[PDB]
Amino acid sequence: PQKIEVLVLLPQDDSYLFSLTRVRPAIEYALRSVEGLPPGTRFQVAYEDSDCGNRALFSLVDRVAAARGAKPDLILGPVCEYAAAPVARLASHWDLPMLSAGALAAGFQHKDSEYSHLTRVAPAYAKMGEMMLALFRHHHWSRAALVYSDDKLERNCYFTLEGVHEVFQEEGLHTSIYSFDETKDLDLEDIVRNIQASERVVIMCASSDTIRSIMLVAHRHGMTSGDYAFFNIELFNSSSYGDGSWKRGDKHDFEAKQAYSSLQTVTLLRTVKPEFEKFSMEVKSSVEKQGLNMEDYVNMFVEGFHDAILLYVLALHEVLRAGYSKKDGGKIIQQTWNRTFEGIAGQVSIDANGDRYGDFSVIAMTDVEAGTQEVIGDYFGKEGRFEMRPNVKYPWGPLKLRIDENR
Amino acid sequence: PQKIEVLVLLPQDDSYLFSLTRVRPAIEYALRSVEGLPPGTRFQVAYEDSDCGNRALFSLVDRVAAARGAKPDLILGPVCEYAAAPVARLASHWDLPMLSAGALAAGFQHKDSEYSHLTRVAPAYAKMGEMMLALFRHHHWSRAALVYSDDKLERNCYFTLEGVHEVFQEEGLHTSIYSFDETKDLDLEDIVRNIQASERVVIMCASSDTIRSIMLVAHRHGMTSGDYAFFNIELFNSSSYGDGSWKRGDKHDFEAKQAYSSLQTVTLLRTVKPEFEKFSMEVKSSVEKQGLNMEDYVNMFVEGFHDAILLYVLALHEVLRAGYSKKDGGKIIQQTWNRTFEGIAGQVSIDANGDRYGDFSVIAMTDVEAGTQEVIGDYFGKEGRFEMRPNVKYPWGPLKLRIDENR
Ligand SMILES: *[C@H]1O[C@H](CO)[C@@H](O[C@H]2O[C@H](CO)[C@@H](O[C@@H]3O[C@H](CO[C@@H]4O[C@H](CO)[C@@H](O)[C@H](O)[C@@H]4O)[C@@H](O[C@H]4O[C@H](CO)[C@@H](O[C@@H]5O[C@H](CO)[C@@H](O)[C@H](O)[C@@H]5O)[C@H](O)[C@@H]4O)[C@H](O)[C@@H]3O)[C@H](O)[C@H]2NC(C)=O)[C@H](O)[C@H]1NC(C)=O
Ligand SMILES: *[C@H]1O[C@H](CO)[C@@H](O[C@H]2O[C@H](CO)[C@@H](O[C@@H]3O[C@H](CO[C@@H]4O[C@H](CO)[C@@H](O)[C@H](O)[C@@H]4O)[C@@H](O[C@H]4O[C@H](CO)[C@@H](O[C@@H]5O[C@H](CO)[C@@H](O)[C@H](O)[C@@H]5O)[C@H](O)[C@@H]4O)[C@H](O)[C@@H]3O)[C@H](O)[C@H]2NC(C)=O)[C@H](O)[C@H]1NC(C)=O
Ligand SMILES: *[C@@H]1O[C@H](CO[C@@H]2O[C@@H](C)[C@@H](O)[C@@H](O)[C@@H]2O)[C@@H](O[C@@H]2O[C@H](CO)[C@@H](O[C@H]3O[C@H](CO)[C@@H](O[C@@H]4O[C@H](CO)[C@@H](O)[C@H](O)[C@@H]4O)[C@H](O)[C@@H]3O)[C@H](O)[C@H]2NC(C)=O)[C@H](O)[C@H]1NC(C)=O
Ligand SMILES: *[C@@H]1O[C@H](CO[C@@H]2O[C@@H](C)[C@@H](O)[C@@H](O)[C@@H]2O)[C@@H](O[C@@H]2O[C@H](CO)[C@@H](O[C@H]3O[C@H](CO)[C@@H](O[C@@H]4O[C@H](CO)[C@@H](O)[C@H](O)[C@@H]4O)[C@H](O)[C@@H]3O)[C@H](O)[C@H]2NC(C)=O)[C@H](O)[C@H]1NC(C)=O
Ligand SMILES: [Cl-]
Ligand SMILES: [Cl-]
Ligand SMILES: [Cl-]
Ligand SMILES: [Cl-]
Missing domain, CATH: 3.40.50.2300 (Response regulator)
Structure with missing residues (x-):
């Protein structure tokens, strides 16, 4: 009964709208609900500071070298441009699926290669x-x-x-x-x-x-x-x-x-659907209890990462049935493109290029x-x-x- | 009696003026002469294709993860902009000294941090x-x-x-x-x-x-x-x-x-000094014997990498005497800046910012x-x-x- 291991690379500095502290609640909220349609498996998530820069690449790399070549099964983030570009380059190399609510820059839409393993959950x-x-x-x-x-x-x-x-x-x-x-x-x-x-x-x-x-x-x-x-x-x-x-x-x-x-x-x-209020109140609660009080607790990023978890599962399920494994990152990414499903804050459509509409x-x-x-x-x-x-x-x-x- | 291990990251495609094939001869020529002023040590050099792009980062990374966290003691290259930037970012992270005859772009002169471990041997x-x-x-x-x-x-x-x-x-x-x-x-x-x-x-x-x-x-x-x-x-x-x-x-x-x-x-x-003719003829010979015949065998890059080897040694020697090791990359790099010495094709001065005059x-x-x-x-x-x-x-x-x- 093996587990899916995900690396979450986001800023440590809560001054960012997509900081580990304000995003984690939502990611966990999605993990909980998803856990109840994979087989009978659990999740293992690691939250590393991306420093919204080079740190992201560093962690991913040290993490791997220190684990004797053991690469995660799913990478969430980074969001920042120069933080996400290298990670996404590695993902494509190590056939890993990278899902981000960032990578908003226009260069990230050319997935003819170095970015073939990336799908942008946020517009x-x-x-x-x-x-x-x-x-x-x-x-x-x-x-x-x-x-x-x-x-x-x-x-x-x-x-x-x-x-x-x-x-x-x-x-x-x-x-x-x-x-x-x-x-x-x-x-x-x-x-x-x-x-x-x-x-x-x-x-x-x-x-x-x-x-x-x-x-x-x-x-x-x-x-x-x-x-x-x-x-x-x-x-x-x-x-x-x-x-x-x-x-x-x-x-x-x-x-x-x-x-x-x-x-x-x-x-x-x-959106006004109830599920979204439950989601909002809970995330607020988490970031509340952990000393931080201003801003809003639900923004494009917070909702994006919750929805990235759901999208991964849907994809994985479809890859397994085809005879592949959580290790065929590209296969998972492909299954992640040109797909529509309901998120906590409404529909989420990914175009044929792996970018959210x-x-x-x-x-x-x-x-x-x-x-x-x-x-x-x-x-x-x-x-x-x-x-x-x-x-x-x-x-x-x-x-x-x-x-x-x-x- | 331990050895210095250097990673040489250059293009495989001989169409580049700084390809592994046209550069290696010169690097070896410098290794030979240097071996006769370190203690009583030898060199161990690995030539990896940089693909003048992302490959460079990949090799360095796979190489390290596959060697259970073992990072080289000196990195030569990459030359290409987008190939050298990430490697140099890693070098700074893993306190490694990176010397290149490339990294010609103007951004590479801001060594306030991510590029603090880089010194450009070529103008x-x-x-x-x-x-x-x-x-x-x-x-x-x-x-x-x-x-x-x-x-x-x-x-x-x-x-x-x-x-x-x-x-x-x-x-x-x-x-x-x-x-x-x-x-x-x-x-x-x-x-x-x-x-x-x-x-x-x-x-x-x-x-x-x-x-x-x-x-x-x-x-x-x-x-x-x-x-x-x-x-x-x-x-x-x-x-x-x-x-x-x-x-x-x-x-x-x-x-x-x-x-x-x-x-x-x-x-x-x-320059017309004899040493440079011996150098030129020998490099020509090597690239000659290995099937490739046009262009010139000595260009700014070929001469640069030979001189990068000499500069490393001079620096290392000065770091040892201070009580540090071939593992203190920054210490070596610093010793590499603001320094002048004779190369195979004439004087080579590095300014206080680690860039060749x-x-x-x-x-x-x-x-x-x-x-x-x-x-x-x-x-x-x-x-x-x-x-x-x-x-x-x-x-x-x-x-x-x-x-x-x-x-
Ligand atoms: C991104 O940003 C935009 C711009 O803000 C968003 O716009 C919307 O923002 C929210 C999203 O839901 C909407 O406001 C919510 O609406 C709920 C329904 O309100 C009804 O409409 C009338 C209007 O006159 C209202 O007066 C009446 O109450 C109606 O019910 C409502 O839910 C909230 O209710 C409490 C207010 O704090 C609170 O308690 C909850 O009560 C309900 C009731 O049973 C239960 O869910 C539960 O018991 C809870 O305890 C809780 O905070 C609820 O959220 C509030 O009005 C709530 O603010 C906005 O109307 C809408 N903006 C506009 C101006 O249209 C986008 O939705 C967003 N998009 C994305 C993609 O994220
Ligand atoms: C980058 O690019 C520039 C532009 O090209 C370079 O410019 C220089 O290029 C070379 C560098 O050395 C110079 O040419 C060399 O000069 C040698 C000396 O020549 C003397 O001057 C007269 C001029 O009329 C000449 O006729 C006479 O022969 C003099 O000796 C000379 O050496 C080469 O000699 C053979 C020619 O192929 C050959 O054999 C060697 O013979 C010598 C003699 O004992 C020995 O070294 C040994 O036995 C060898 O077998 C060998 O190829 C020698 O190299 C040639 O003239 C040689 O080409 C250019 O003059 C100079 N350019 C100009 C126009 O000034 C820069 O130097 C370079 N800079 C950098 C930083 O890299
Ligand atoms: C991208 O996804 C779509 C699938 O549609 C979407 O996905 C679903 C799950 C939802 O998210 C929806 O919102 C989306 O609709 C694929 O794109 C193309 O889909 C079209 C139909 O949407 C499909 O068309 C074929 O069938 C049509 C008939 O509908 C034929 O075209 C004409 O049909 C009329 C009669 O209707 C005839 O009179 C004409 O002669 C002509 O035949 C034709 O057979 C089309 O092939 C299309 O095949 C399909 N792919 C194409 C061609 O772009 C993509 O496959 C998914 N990925 C991508 C874009 O590659
Ligand atoms: C960078 O290197 C240089 C060292 O010089 C270079 O290195 C050698 C190995 C060769 O490559 C040469 O080509 C280069 O010259 C350091 O830069 C500065 O060097 C200067 C001297 O080159 C040094 O000056 C101090 O001494 C002068 C006297 O020379 C004093 O200034 C005046 O002197 C007159 C009399 O001469 C008095 O009448 C005045 O009152 C006044 O005192 C003063 O004491 C200078 O400090 C200088 O100290 C030194 N560093 C400075 C200040 O930039 C760098 O240290 C190396 N690295 C860097 C740039 O940080
Ligand atoms: Cl980030
Ligand atoms: Cl760091
Ligand atoms: Cl290169
Ligand atoms: Cl590759």
């Missing part, structure tokens, strides 16, 4: 551009201002939007890019001004607050009344990037409530007086269509107007 | 820019056309010249870049024309023949008589990049002889009738000065004129 950066482009086709838009902060680290926002940018170029849409890092004082006044003289549609990606601030300034300039379309992206369904919460409890709450009436927050497709929701303020938010549209990556949710009540408000770039 | 791409810049200061030039072919592989030429470019930008020199790949038909006619309407000084990097061809076209346009300064770079002192040999034995020999009177070939500092020569035709080439200038990286060789007889010829960019 890659490129998927935001595909979504945005469909939105503009629906709204008949063709120009836009891309505003984003810049890490000079992971540059999550920089890549998300530059991805969008890069897509619009090929399709002929004209854009205006505005970069800046929130680590420094915000000369947002300068930005908001340039924007009002540049485009009618703005797509932003930055901290929850940097977004709220940009809105107050554009509100001060009365651009918040319907002649401007504002979009902030909640990267990896993390509150830290702005989920549309205009309230704070300060001098500007009312001012902010009104401003947000023109803001549309793009998030991962909305991106499903998104668009949340807008539908009751300006109340400040009540509500999803009004969804983008399904598989079918590649954007669709406005039927029977959403919006009797009056700035979203009733038709933006126009003839200015 | 890095950046060194060409430092040399060229000094030449222009001496010639009082300030504008130039950078012509180079483009691999879309290693892009040796692309990087050499873009390095020069990148340096001129910071120093305020204006440039014109002309890219093209010799894999396709050469529309050189278009180039030569643009150039004559652009600058008076041209710096090229491309195959021996692509250079000879560019010269015949510029000669056909009579730009070869002294109003234009032509420079081709003999990358890694390899004939394949043009060493100034205008003769071929075709219809155009005479035409070419005249054209080359305006060409100045930049090579690695010239570039010493170059400039060969020009000093007897236009005869077609006789001769070095007329040298650039010493350490002192960073360009100097024209005294008492070189040039009574008449296009090199007697003073180029002028007032056109």
Whole structure:
């Protein structure tokens, strides 16, 4: 009765949204449920710090050399670009299956070889551009201002939007890019001004607050009344990037409530299924008990790794029946591509290239007086269509107007 | 009486100038001479194919895991960028000393950490820019056309010249870049024309023949008589990049002889010391006997690795005396930096950052009738000065004129 041995390579520093501490709960939650459809086997999981860098490769390597050539049966992570690339190169070499909710970089989509043993469970950066482009086709838009902060680290926002940018170029849409890092004082006044003289549609990606601030300034300039379309992206369904919460409890709450009436927050497709609440509460509990309290406990990564466990099992089961073993990594990976199944937060489809299709929701303020938010549209990556949710009540408000770039 | 174990990671494909077959002779030649100043120890060298890519990391890793955690005492190579980066990352991790005649990329000069255990024995791409810049200061030039072919592989030429470019930008020199790949038909006619309407000084990097061809076209346009300064770079002192040999034995020999009177070939500092002839003949012999006959047997890489062996020994000796062992890689590397010694092809100085200083020569035709080439200038990286060789007889010829960019 032998066991499946998995190596989980994630950051030790809880400052990352995909740190071992905030991710492990979810991985274990999936292990529990999966254990009750393999034969009659158990799991053995090792959590190593990737340091979101070279450490990841090091562990995997030392681990193997120190275990007299014994390589794991499944590798989860790394997430970071330069941390995941080498590990994935090794996985392909040692015919191991590597599943990550990271490896978002666009280079990771060329699996003609060194990356043939990788499948990305989370939507890659490129998927935001595909979504945005469909939105503009629906709204008949063709120009836009891309505003984003810049890490000079992971540059999550920089890549998300530059991805969008890069897509619009090929399709002929004209854009205006505005970069800046929130680590420094915000000369947002300068930005908001340039924007009002540049485009009618703005797509932003930055901290929850940097977004709220940009809105107050554009509100001060009365651009918040319907002649401007504002979009902030909640990267990896993390509150830290702005989920549309205009309230704070300060001098500007009312001012902010009104401003947000023109803001549309793009998030991962909305779910409310109970299973997801049980999941959320439990993960919160775990990270709670272990001293750490802020942020949200469920983000794109946390949900991704839970779903990566399920995907592995489904694949394994199908490989066994074919006569192969948990040791034929490529065979497992192949079985992992072009497949759909239900995750804790909704459907999860992997395209024929082993990359997750991106499903998104668009949340807008539908009751300006109340400040009540509500999803009004969804983008399904598989079918590649954007669709406005039927029977959403919006009797009056700035979203009733038709933006126009003839200015 | 224990032995030093070295891993040599180089390409298997002899199409590379630094392939295991063309490099090994030189490494062995250095091993022989070194063996007669360590104690009373011998060497043990393993030659693994790097595939000029991921293979390098793989071997090093499998090799170690398969030898129950036994890591070599010295790693030679890889040369290729993406092949050497990971190996060097591991070296730093396993406190191993890595010496390469490659790792020419500019990122490899930041040894604040992941690259702290690397020392580059060959002059890095950046060194060409430092040399060229000094030449222009001496010639009082300030504008130039950078012509180079483009691999879309290693892009040796692309990087050499873009390095020069990148340096001129910071120093305020204006440039014109002309890219093209010799894999396709050469529309050189278009180039030569643009150039004559652009600058008076041209710096090229491309195959021996692509250079000879560019010269015949510029000669056909009579730009070869002294109003234009032509420079081709003999990358890694390899004939394949043009060493100034205008003769071929075709219809155009005479035409070419005249054209080359305006060409100045930049090579690695010239040597004629006997030891270097013995070295050259022997390496030629080895690669000869082993079925392979073209190209030249001594290039920057071949000489580099011979010199890397000597540098290791010098360092080791100094580490022992300090009370450390062949196992303190960093200690050895440190002892390898900021050091000068005589190699088989002349002095070799390593700067305080562990990078070789570039010493170059400039060969020009000093007897236009005869077609006789001769070095007329040298650039010493350490002192960073360009100097024209005294008492070189040039009574008449296009090199007697003073180029002028007032056109
Ligand atoms: C990524 O990010 C986006 C943006 O945030 C997500 O958007 C959604 O976020 C959550 C996901 O479920 C939704 O909120 C949840 O909705 C539950 C149902 O609410 C009903 O709707 C009305 C609306 O007026 C509400 O007032 C009423 O309560 C309805 O039931 C609801 O569940 C939560 O309930 C408690 C609130 O803290 C709490 O206790 C639980 O109670 C239930 C009731 O039996 C049980 O499950 C159990 O007993 C629990 O104890 C618990 O926290 C529950 O979660 C809450 O309203 C809950 O917040 C958002 O509506 C939705 N966002 C919007 C604006 O549409 C995406 O879903 C996400 N996507 C991905 C891919 O991750
Ligand atoms: C990288 O690339 C550049 C560009 O090519 C190099 O430039 C130099 O290249 C070589 C390096 O040594 C030089 O050529 C060698 O010079 C030897 C001395 O020649 C003398 O000068 C006159 C010039 O008119 C010459 O006619 C006369 O012969 C003088 O002796 C000479 O040695 C070679 O001799 C034989 C030729 O094939 C051959 O046999 C040997 O004979 C000698 C004699 O006793 C002994 O060593 C032994 O018996 C051998 O059997 C052997 O091949 C010898 O090498 C040849 O002229 C030889 O080619 C170039 O002059 C010089 N280039 C120029 C134009 O200046 C750089 O040096 C190089 N740098 C680096 C860092 O690698
Ligand atoms: C990738 O997966 C799909 C399977 O579909 C998906 O997977 C399921 C589990 C769910 O996730 C779904 O959401 C997805 O649909 C494979 O792709 C191709 O699937 C199509 C059908 O989806 C299949 O088509 C064959 O059959 C059609 C008929 O449907 C034939 O085409 C025409 O049919 C009409 C009549 O319907 C005739 O009048 C025409 O003459 C013509 O025949 C034809 O026979 C198709 O071959 C298709 O074969 C299949 N593969 C292809 C060709 O891309 C992939 O195989 C999976 N992996 C990949 C992409 O390689
Ligand atoms: C890097 O190596 C050099 C050593 O020099 C090199 O190595 C030798 C083996 C050969 O390869 C040579 O080609 C090279 O020269 C170290 O760099 C610095 O070296 C200098 C001298 O080269 C040294 O200077 C100290 O001494 C000077 C006097 O020479 C003092 O400076 C002034 O001196 C005048 C009188 O001469 C006084 O009137 C002034 O008041 C003033 O004192 C001063 O004391 C200098 O410290 C220097 O100390 C040394 N290191 C420094 C400071 O960079 C490096 O140590 C090696 N590694 C590195 C770069 O860290
Ligand atoms: Cl990571
Ligand atoms: Cl480490
Ligand atoms: Cl290599
Ligand atoms: Cl391989």
